[PDB]
Enzyme design. Sequence first.
Site, short mmCIF file in Angstrom:
data_model
loop_
_atom_site.label_atom_id
_atom_site.label_comp_id
_atom_site.label_asym_id
_atom_site.label_seq_id
_atom_site.Cartn_x
_atom_site.Cartn_y
_atom_site.Cartn_z
CG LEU A 210 -2.20 0.82 1.28
CD1 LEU A 210 -1.92 2.29 1.26
CD2 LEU A 210 -3.08 0.47 0.08
CG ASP A 211 1.91 5.29 -2.64
OD1 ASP A 211 3.01 5.39 -2.06
OD2 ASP A 211 1.47 6.17 -3.42
CB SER A 212 3.79 6.21 2.00
OG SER A 212 3.79 7.38 2.80
CG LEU A 213 -0.05 10.08 -2.33
CD1 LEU A 213 -1.32 9.62 -3.02
CD2 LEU A 213 -0.31 11.24 -1.36
CG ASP A 214 -2.86 5.29 -1.77
OD1 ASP A 214 -1.83 5.88 -2.16
OD2 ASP A 214 -3.71 4.82 -2.55
#
Lengths: 86, 606, 99, 64, 173, 75, 57, 172, 459
Positions: free
Chosen positions: A40-44
């Site tokens: 899961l992307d840190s921007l999410d």
Amino acid sequence: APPLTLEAIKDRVLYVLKLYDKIDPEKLSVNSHFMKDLGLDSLDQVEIIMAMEDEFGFEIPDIDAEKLMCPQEIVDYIADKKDVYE
Amino acid sequence: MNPFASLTLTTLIILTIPIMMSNSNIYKTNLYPNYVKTTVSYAFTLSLVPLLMFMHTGQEMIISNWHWMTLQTVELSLSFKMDYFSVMFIPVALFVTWSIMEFSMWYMHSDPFINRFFKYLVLFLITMMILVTANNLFQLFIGWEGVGIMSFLLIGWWHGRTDANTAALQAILYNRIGDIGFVLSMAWFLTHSNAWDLQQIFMLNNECPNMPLIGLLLAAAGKSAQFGLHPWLPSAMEGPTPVSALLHSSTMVVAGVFLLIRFYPLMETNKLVQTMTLCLGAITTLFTALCAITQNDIKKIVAFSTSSQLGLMMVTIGINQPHLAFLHICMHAFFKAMLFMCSGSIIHSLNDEQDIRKMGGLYKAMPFTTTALIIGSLALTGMPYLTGFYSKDLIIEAVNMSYTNAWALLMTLIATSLTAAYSTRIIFFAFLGKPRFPPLVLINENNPLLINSIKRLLIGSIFAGFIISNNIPPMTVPNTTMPLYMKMTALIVTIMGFMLALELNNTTYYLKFKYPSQTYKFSNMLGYYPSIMHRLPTYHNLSMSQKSASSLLDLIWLETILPKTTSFIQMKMSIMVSNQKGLIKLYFLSFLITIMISMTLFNYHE
Amino acid sequence: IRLQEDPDPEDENLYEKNPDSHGYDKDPIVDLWNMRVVFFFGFSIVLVLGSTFVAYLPDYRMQEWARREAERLVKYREANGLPLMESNCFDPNKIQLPE
Amino acid sequence: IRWTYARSANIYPNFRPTPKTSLLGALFGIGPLFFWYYVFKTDRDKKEKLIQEGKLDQTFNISY
Amino acid sequence: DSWDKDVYPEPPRRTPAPAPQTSLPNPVTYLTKIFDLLVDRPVTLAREFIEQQHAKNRYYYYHREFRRVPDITECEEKDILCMFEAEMQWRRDYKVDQEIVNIIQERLKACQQREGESYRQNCAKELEQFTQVSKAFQDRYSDLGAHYSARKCLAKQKQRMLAERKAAKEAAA
Amino acid sequence: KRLFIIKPSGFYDRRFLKLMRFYILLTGIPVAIGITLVNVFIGEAELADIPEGYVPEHWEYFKHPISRWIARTFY
Amino acid sequence: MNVLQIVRDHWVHILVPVGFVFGCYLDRRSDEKLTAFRNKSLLFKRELRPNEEVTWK
Amino acid sequence: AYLTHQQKVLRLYKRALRHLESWCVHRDKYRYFACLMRARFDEHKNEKDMVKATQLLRQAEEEFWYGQHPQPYIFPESPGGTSYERYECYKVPEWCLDDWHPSEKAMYPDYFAKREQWKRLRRESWEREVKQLQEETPPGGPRTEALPPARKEGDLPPLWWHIVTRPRERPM
Amino acid sequence: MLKIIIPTTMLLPMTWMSKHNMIWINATVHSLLISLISLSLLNQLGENSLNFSLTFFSDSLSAPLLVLTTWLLPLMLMASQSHLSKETTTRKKLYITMLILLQLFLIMTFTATELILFYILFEATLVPTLIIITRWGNQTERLNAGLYFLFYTLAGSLPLLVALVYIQNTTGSLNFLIIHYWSHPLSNSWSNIFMWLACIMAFMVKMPLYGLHLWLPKAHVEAPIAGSMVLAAVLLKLGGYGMMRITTILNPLTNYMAYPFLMLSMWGMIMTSSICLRQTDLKSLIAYSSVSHMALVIVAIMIQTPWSFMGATALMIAHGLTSSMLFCLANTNYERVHSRTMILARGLQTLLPLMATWWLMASLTNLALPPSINLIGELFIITASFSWSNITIILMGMNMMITALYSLYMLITTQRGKYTHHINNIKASFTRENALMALHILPLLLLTLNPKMILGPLY
Ligand SMILES: CCCCCCCCCCCCCCCCCC(=O)O[C@@H](COC(=O)CCCCCCCCCCCCCCC)COP(=O)(O)OC[C@H](O)CO
């Protein structure tokens, strides 16, 4: 309001990550560290803690928002911020 | 000498008992809220008998009880004047606060200081029924700050909340601006009319009260939160919900309007002063309503709706309509108080959330609360034959049917249309929608305390004006031949305002997004008033206090001109006197000079 | 060390020694007696009967005697019909104004 | 304690008479006092000018 | 009655006889009825008990009367022994005159509620009586200063007929 | 559940508040009884005309008995 | 009952009371010199009682 | 400390969406505009020129500073919210409980007994935890407010008392 | 007369010869008793002042102040037996000797029948206060503060001495009755202005008006609790008593010469109350508030109007009792925190619940909230000033506006708000402090029922 306890938090917590379609249910673990294993992307990540914020109704400061990372640790920070001990 | 006079006074002495019992501290520290509620209930039931005696006969009392103290030609005495205004305000104010008291138990079921809370309400309640009932100006002045200070403590009920103290400090300050006008009228009446009893002032027919009426007007504007002195009332939402539901909804804030109703006979004789009364009411109606339709907190919406109402009340007292203004006070007492407890119902139940953007779908979730709010909303808008119709529809017709300022008359119509506008906003966002609150739903209104309190006020609002209008003697001149185009205006504008507000509100359902219009950036920020006028003047006067004043004068100049200069002069010449050389030669030379000047030059010999 | 001095003594708590301390002094028995003195000769003797003394003080400033002379004066005054109270006080008839 | 000192005592020892302080002291000192003197003087110069000639009404004014 | 009717003239009360035509009961009559046998009578029974006890041991008190003394317009210059009687007598009349204005003020205030909406024209007699008294009071004690004394009152008065007689000379022409 | 609530000690305040209600009432009720008692025992004097051949006592020119007694005993 | 000591530590309680008792004495002594116009002011001067000789002490 | 760029954009992303929520209000609109707002965020993710990213940031908040809702949505418990320190006036420090009169303390014996234990641990732990702090203090004073844990076993983490014994957020 | 003076001075041997630990007790017993006897003095006749002898007399103005001073006397003893417990018995006895000797002089001064006799102990009050401020004061700048307080009043009092003896050699006796009956119209000769200036400036200094008020902040702050109350609750009123007695022979010169003082006072109250709005020291804030209220009296007395005099006495008693209470408030929290900065100890209401109530009603009384006597005093002055001129209400009312802000400013900053975490020595308030507080506030409300008692001779 009935006393919301840690078992209630985690049940509500992993409910929403299971809801989150990029976090598919089968590989949900209480200690599922997001980008290392869920990818899961840190921007999410900054997007899911506000999902937690509306889930329990309060604000998570930015200082620990990026620190709030593990679903168990999600529950861990929820409990003390509301002195949830049971 | 009927029971009327005796038992109308004992009504007041009833509500004093809970205060005295509380100070004993033997008082029931558990069921005290039940004690006071039932006490106010009995005071209400007692308050009926003077009323039923009134519409039958029409007698109004003056009870000049114990003589306080006499000042040469002044005989300041505790005196209660049971006017038609006082004889009816007593029951309705008691009825509302009794309804609030039942609601207060449910809302504050967890506040540890609940007994202190109820004690404060009575003290406020005491201070008001001695304000409305005041035969002399001094005891009228007693309530005018007794209610104000009680508001300060109640607003700052949550002492720790820094903003609550700021709002509490704000409320007393804006009120205090009005007291400058109050004391100005006090001084003039005593100096010129040589009294403070309302009787002598009326008899001495001060038909040129230019300064007095201006003083009275300034007192009302601060208390009733008019333009220039409004924003304390919208900022008074930081207090708890039942507190605002009683004081800053229909009971405390209306005191300023009630002041001119007391002094109406002198008010009408002048022509100049009532002009800016309806002028001030006119501007207040927009600016409060204009900011109302753009806020997102129910408490903010409702209060701005109140201040718009008190804007409308003074429009009535503008063109020689005092009695209809007092009628509007009674009607505003019923439905406006309901709206706050209805909003308080959805606030507490939906986890003390006050942002109107988080409700939706509450229509089926709260059938009774939704039912109560829509009736209150219709009453506020002025649906015919129901509460507000008997006052607002008469008023809008009345102000149109008179020689008034053209701009002022147009002002009320926009307000009435805007009055419906925010009313739709509440019903649309809060009820007519989809759920937006946190997932855990704790929706609840089944508590009998809430149901009984709301229903008690609800059945009052349903009929309300029908009983009062049919019972009170016809004591205003009724205009009859209205051209139908303007007689419908009371209904046209609100129905019109319904249409656009509904269309604008469900435009949010439309997927399109628009950047903020500069008008919205203006209306939503409380009309730009608090951002400037609470930051610019406060900074200057405070900066003047420290930079100048104290530091510049008190600690620098005033200590340098008189004290330090004399000390500096003394020291500078003390050293030169004491700085001697110790050589006899110089001292004896001084003697030779001293002998010489004394002998001849200073003419001491002749 | 500048001077041979003593450190600032710690503020003793009157409560920690005797939890029923009354803040009047250190010794308990006199403290309890100090309670009795201040309240008795304070609230009880001075405040209660003193208030009754001043409340029930005899006619001060002749506030009621002046009234009792007023009605007998006014009733006499309008009985004859002459003006209710003269604009002049020292009867001008005996005044011997210069020129 | 530094703030209280700098705002209570450490002003005059650090004060120096300069035209900025001098003018400001005079402006906020004698200035308002004389201004209010002028306002009340003329008002108290207009008030009696009315009553010696009987141009003001105090028919019911007794408790002055 | 305890007070005097001449001092406090009370016009007779015009109370209409009750003559209703509606068949449904008039509630107010009942509230006065159940008040009479619940509050009024027990108060009266207690009152008649205290009155008979009061008359059982009746003690009297009278009203102090000060005889006339030479006032300040005939008191010799200096001679504070005569000034004392003069000043005290004048100050006694000051309080009496203050009470006289009070008696008029209550009568004027009494008209207001008594005449109701007729106050404007019904008791114009009350208005002029107060106007006459207030004007005369102004010539007597007004603007005497916080240190008012019978000397100043004589001084202010002596100016009044000084200007008046000067006006009389001008009027005669 | 039920859990301990922390609160500043009110005992000293409570004891102190009890002391007024004791000590003020200690002379309160006897005085309140006395003022009422003289009002149910000898009553209030009436405005009697001055009898001939007898000037009153110095304290006699008062209607309330307590005021007369205060004048009698002190002034 | 410790009387030899209770007086030693509580004899101070009597000075102020007798001071007030003393205070009235000079109050009721100095006025005698101030007699002068006793029953002499025409405002209060009146016939003497058959037995009493001094109107105001 | 070093408020690095990636933290800034996340803060930009979080608050802008919160403002965006305050605008659309309705959930479907909020979900829709967040996704497009999401899309226009990650589309420009390949910039070796960090300066250009800052330049793209410079006009970002300026539009936000115009796009900001004049009345944004805040949960009441947060600063600015309606329920901010509303229950502060009820919470009272634990040390004040030591003042309590013995009769008051006798009303709660076992809890006060448990308080005595807490007083006991905090006494010797203070010396232990201060000793750990001194022996591991970085030279030239602490560099960051972050506090080290208890390295050895048994001992409590340093400066633990006030955080652990902090009054609960809902004291009544 | 002597029924109050001798018991007061006879109290002095009692404290000196009492037991080691009973000094506070026995002094408190009879100090309350003296007030009871003084309360009997409060009765007044119709118009003639209650005259006792050539040496002493009392009127409707002196009596309310007399009972105030005697009533005060127990309160300093109550308020002082906390910071003097750790002192040697002789110094405690010496301290107690100072107050009762001081309290003796106040009784003598108010009851004085001759202006010179009034004058002698008018200055004599300073000697005990100077000792109290300097010796037992708990600070460093008390030394300079004592010098400022002493020299300011002396610089004004000595010209009065030359003025008073001039009246003696020109108009014979200066007895208050003879000077009032034989008053003559003071001329406008340029000497009479300096005659007027000398007879007034003496009371002006110890009645702090704008400019001549810098001794008050340093005196009030630096003095101990007992010294602060006596200097603020009775001493400032010494100037007030002086005027009502001394402007008998200053008319009509007071009509024209009043302007510079009126302008300095009416503007001064706005400035001084503005200082209160931004004061860092709690005691200083209370001290500056005393300047504003006293400056209000300055306008009241100098107007020379019956209404103005009545409100002057009303504010005179009310402000003294209230300022004494507030100084008790500041004193009661000071040793707990051992500092005077207001913001140091915030949120005291949460820790001390009753002190919140006591400080609350103290604020309302200082607010001139009706029907407290402060309101009666201020409201009476407003009407008297308004009749004097219509504009003054703008200044008059604005003071009440500013008074609302700073009076509540201490309440919010100290009582309300978040408690400061680091402090842990705040113990539950001693019942002595609570009792002393009710000793102040309760008679104030008791006076509300009978304003006629404190209205003054003009009533
Ligand atoms: C710190 C400075 C002073 C502070 C402020 C104090 C008040 C200011 C004015 C001070 C006046 C002090 C002297 C006043 C004494 C009484 C005055 C009096 O009664 O009036 C006389 C006024 O007469 C005077 O001359 C009085 C003094 C006038 C001022 C000159 C001296 C005072 C100023 C300087 C000394 C004080 C300043 C400080 C110096 C270090 C009347 O006499 P007469 O002149 O009318 O005599 C009859 C005939 O006309 C001829 O004699």
